[PDB]
């Protein structure tokens, strides 16, 4: 809906990921059946019946046979299972089986947070990473023009009133990056920012 509708597609499209974008999915995403092309997808932690709770990105580099998992909070698999009841165990298996000769795969997932605890900007952070992936499929997590704009923070420090200013800045940079490269974002700024604000989910 407002906090990133399934129109991360429009933005993803604007960012030039079109030739690699499989689309938006819910927890049921099967995996990658693409042993020859770069593919990427924005997956939700929940089933469509629920409406969606957390957006995350998956990317596949057949050349290096590595699968990228970018979930904005950098949560451990243990905490992913707990907080969101999500597991990407079957999709990895499928992906190795369907896309790799030796049925092996290297998983590379972020271990740091770039998003604030009360922020509803997850879907947007995924689009920014997919831009990084499309342009630098060998080093998308860091060390590239796009991701150098934001700073990762050890997950244990997510709620620390100390790194909060780094996390709000990250989001300022997010918004401006989309502003620069996305006609759709530009023509929808007020709506998107307000729908995905840094403090959007703060308790009252």
């Amino acid at each position: 809906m407002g906090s990133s509708e399934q129109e991360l597609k429009a933005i993803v499209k604007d960012l030039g990921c079109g030739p690699y974008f499989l689309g938006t999915y819910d927890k049921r995403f099967p995996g990658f059946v693409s042993p020859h092309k770069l593919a990427c997808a924005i997956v939700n932690t929940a089933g469509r019946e629920t409406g969606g709770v957390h957006w995350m990105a998956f990317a596949w580099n057949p050349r290096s046979k590595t699968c990228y998992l970018f979930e904005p909070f950098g949560f451990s698999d243990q905490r992913l299972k707990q907080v969101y009841q999500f597991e990407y165990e079957s999709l990895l298996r499928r992906s190795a089986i369907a896309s790799s000769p030796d049925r092996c795969i290297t998983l590379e997932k972020s271990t740091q947070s770039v998003q604030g605890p009360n922020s509803a900007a997850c879907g947007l952070f995924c689009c920014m990473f997919l831009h990084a992936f499309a342009n630098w499929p060998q080093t998308p997590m860091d060390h590239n023009p796009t991701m150098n704009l934001i700073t990762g923070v050890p997950n244990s420090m997510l709620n620390s009133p100390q790194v909060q200013p780094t996390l709000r800045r990250n989001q300022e940079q997010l918004y401006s990056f989309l502003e620069r490269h996305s006609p759709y974002f530009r023509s929808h700024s007020a709506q998107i920012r307000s729908a995905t604000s840094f403090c959007h989910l703060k308790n009252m």
């Binding site: 950098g74 290297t106 740091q112």
Partner: peptide, 11 residues
């Protein structure tokens, strides 16, 4: 950017 973790996975 963010730090990542690489794991080999064979099935």
């Amino acid at each position: 950017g963010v730090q990542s973790l690489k794991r080999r996975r064979c099935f």
